[PDB]
Ligand SMILES: Cc1ncc(COP(=O)(O)O)c(/C=N/[C@@H](CO)C(=O)O)c1O
Ligand SMILES: Nc1ccccc1O
Ligand SMILES: Nc1ccccc1O
Ligand SMILES: [Cl-]
Ligand SMILES: [Cl-]
Ligand SMILES: [Cl-]
Ligand SMILES: [Cl-]
C-alpha cells in the first residue's frame with residue numbers, strides 16, 4: 001500500500017488531486033485492454049482501478065455490465081487477469097493499482113491465497129464490492145498480511161459509526177460515493193478520500209478536490225469511450241487520451 | 254452490528270454492498286419487533302386463516318403405500334391460496350413492509366409462484382408491486398406472468414447476464430438500494446443475506462407446527478421423518494423448524510438431480526456444489542472452478558436456484574438433517590403415481606420429495622415407518638410440461 005502513500009505525498013507537493021480511471025480487465029480483449037491501460041497512464045492517470053470480470057456484478061450499473069460482458073465474451077479468466085496485472089505492474093512501477101473484486105472470486109481459491117497472488121503481481125489495494133464493513137474482517141486481515149490496502153466504500157447514507165469504522169480499518173484510500181463527510185473522514189484520520197460514482201466531466205474532478213477529497217475516480221465515462229469506439233481502436237485510444245488528460249488537468253484546481 | 258447472529262455456523266452472513274446494510278438492519282429490527290408484537294401476530298394469523306385458508310389439511314395416503322409398512326401423510330400446502338406455500342411468508346413480509354411504513358414491494362421470481370404470491374399479497378394489502386424476472390423465465394412462464402399482471406403488479410423482464418433468476422435477483426437488489434426508504438424487497442426463499450433466511454423460516458414455520466399438532470392428534474406420535482424438496486429452502490425449513498429439537502424426527506431435504514448428478518445437469522449444490530459467496534450469503538453453490546456462478550437445471554422450474562439456504566447447509570454439516578437428490582425421471586414417476594393413486598396432482602417440485610418417500614418405502618417395504626411429505630404446491634401449472642414429455646416418449 002506504500003504506493004498510495006507515495007502518490008498522495010507527491011500530489012500534495014504538486015497541490016493536485018488524484019484522477020483515477022476505472023476499466024474492466026480484458027475489455028474488449030486482453031491486448032486491447034493492456035493498450036487502453038497504457039494509454040490511460042500515458043494521458044496522466046494517477047492510479048488505476050481495475051475490475052475483474054465476474055458473472056453477476058451486482059454493484060455495477062449498465063455501462064460496466066457491458067464491459068464485463070465483453071470481457072466474458074473474450075474468455076478473460078481470473079488467471080489471465082493476474083497475468084495482465086503482473087505485466088501492468090512491470091510496465092509501471094510506481095502507479096497504484098487497485099482491484100474491484102466480488103467476494104466469490106476472492107473466496108474461490110482461498111482468501112489468503114487470493115491476496116498472496118495480488119501481492120505477487122504487485123496489486124496495491126482491493127475493494128470487495130459485496131463485503132460490508134460488518135463482514136470485512138477475514139478480507140481485511142488477509143489483505144494487510146500481504147501488504148494490500150483494504151478499500152472501504154463510504155456511502156451517501158453513512159452515519160458516524162460507519163465513518164469511524166471506515167477510518168479505522170481502511171488503508172490506501174477511502175472510496176467516497178458531502179463536505180461535512182470529508183471533514184469527519186479527515187478528523188478521523190481516514191485514508192485519503194476519492195470520490196466516485198458521479199465523475200464524468202472535468203468540472204466534477206475540480207469540484208471533488210475543491211470539496212477536500214484527494215481526487216476522483218471515473219468509471220462509466222471511461223468505459224463509455226471504449227464502447228463508443230469498439231470498431232476504431234485508434235479512435236478509441238485517441239478519445240481516451242483526450243478525456244484522461246482533460247480530467248487530470250482538472251485535478252490541479 | 255445486528256440484533257441476531259447472521260450466521261448458521263459457518264454459513265450465511267450479510268454479503269451485500271455497504272449501501273444496503275441500513276436496509277437489512279431496518280428489516281431485522283422490524284422483524285424482531287414484530288415477533289414480540291401480539292398485534293402483528295394477530296394480523297398475520299387473520300390473513301393466514303381467513304384469506305389463505307390455513308390450517309391446511311394433513312392427508313393420509315390411502316393407496317400409494319399399499320403393500321408396505323409405510324404410512325405416508327401429505328402436508329397440503331397445495332390447498333393454500335395461490336396453490337403453493339409461497340403465500341404464507343409473503344403475507345408476513347407484506348405486513349413487515351407496512352410496519353416499516355413502506356408502500357412498495359420489490360420481488361424476484363423464477364418459476365413465477367413467488368412472483369404471483371408477492372403480487373396477490375400486494376393487491377390485498379394495498380402495496381405497489383414490481384417483480385423482476387429473467388427474460389428467459391418470462392418467456393417460459395407466460396401464465397404466471399399474466400397472473401401477476403392481472404393482480405396489478407408490474408413485471409420487469411431482466412435481460413442482463415443469463416436472463417434468469419440470478420439476474421432478476423441482482424436487478425431487484427439494485428432497485429432496493431435506491432428505493433428502500435419506501436420499498437421492501439420481498440425475497441422469496443430462505444436464503445440471501447441475513448435477516449432473510451431467519452425471517453422466511455419464521456414466516457413458514459406454521460407448516461411444521463401444524464404438521465406436528467396434526468400428526469400427534471392423528472397418530473399419537475411424531476413422524477419418523479419429514480421430507481421436503483429444497484429449491485432455495487423455504488418450504489423445507491418451514492416443515493423442519495418445529496421438529497429441529499425433536500431429534501428422533503428425521504429431516505430429509507431433496508434437491509433436484511436433474512439429468513443425473515454425474516451429468517452435471519442438476520440443482521443440488523448442497524451435496525454436489527462448492528461453498529462460495531453470492532446472493533448475499535456464504536453457502537454451497539453451483540459454480541465453475543474459476544468461481545463463476547452456474548445454473549441449476551431441473552425439470553421443475555421452481556427448483557432452479559443455483560444455491561441453497563444457509564440453515565440447510567448448517568443442519569447438514571452437523572448431521573441434524575440429511576439431503577438427497579431425485580432425478581427428473583423419478584420426480585415424474587412420483588407425479589404420475591400420486592395422480593392415479595390419490596387423485597392429487599402435485600407440483601413437480603414437491604414431486605421430488607414424494608419420489609424420495611416412495612424410494613424409502615419401496616426399498617424397505619417391511620420397514621415400519623411414519624413419513625410426512627410436504628406437498629408444497631399443486632401441479633396444475635405442470636400439466637403442459639408433463640403432457641409434452643409423455644407425448645415425446647410415445648405415451
Ligand atoms: C411450487 C414450488 N415448490 C417449491 C419451490 C422451491 O422453493 P423453496 O425451496 O420452498 O423455497 C418453488 C420455488 N419457486 C421459486 C423459484 O422459481 C419462484 O416461484 O420464484 C415452487 O414454486
Ligand atoms: N450508514 C451505514 C451504517 C452502517 C452500515 C452501512 C451504512 O450505509
Ligand atoms: N388461483 C390463483 C392462483 C394464483 C394466485 C391467485 C389465485 O386466485
Ligand atoms: Cl509509474
Ligand atoms: Cl477461505
Ligand atoms: Cl469467510
Ligand atoms: Cl488509516
Ligand SMILES: [Cl-]
Nearest residue numbers: 262263567570
Ligand atoms: Cl457449520
Ligand SMILES: [Cl-]
Nearest residue numbers: 288289290291
Ligand atoms: Cl407475542
Ligand SMILES: [Cl-]
Nearest residue numbers: 475476477501
Ligand atoms: Cl419419531
Ligand SMILES: [Cl-]
Nearest residue numbers: 549550551557
Ligand atoms: Cl431450471
Ligand SMILES: [Cl-]
Nearest residue numbers: 261564567568
Ligand atoms: Cl439450526
Ligand SMILES: [Cl-]
Nearest residue numbers: 500571572573
Ligand atoms: Cl444432530
Ligand SMILES: [Cl-]
Nearest residue numbers: 512580581582
Ligand atoms: Cl432423469
Ligand SMILES: [Cl-]
Nearest residue numbers: 636637640641
Ligand atoms: Cl393439455
Ligand SMILES: [Cs+]
Nearest residue numbers: 318321322323
Ligand atoms: Cs401401509
Ligand SMILES: [Cs+]
Nearest residue numbers: 483484520558
Ligand atoms: Cs437448488
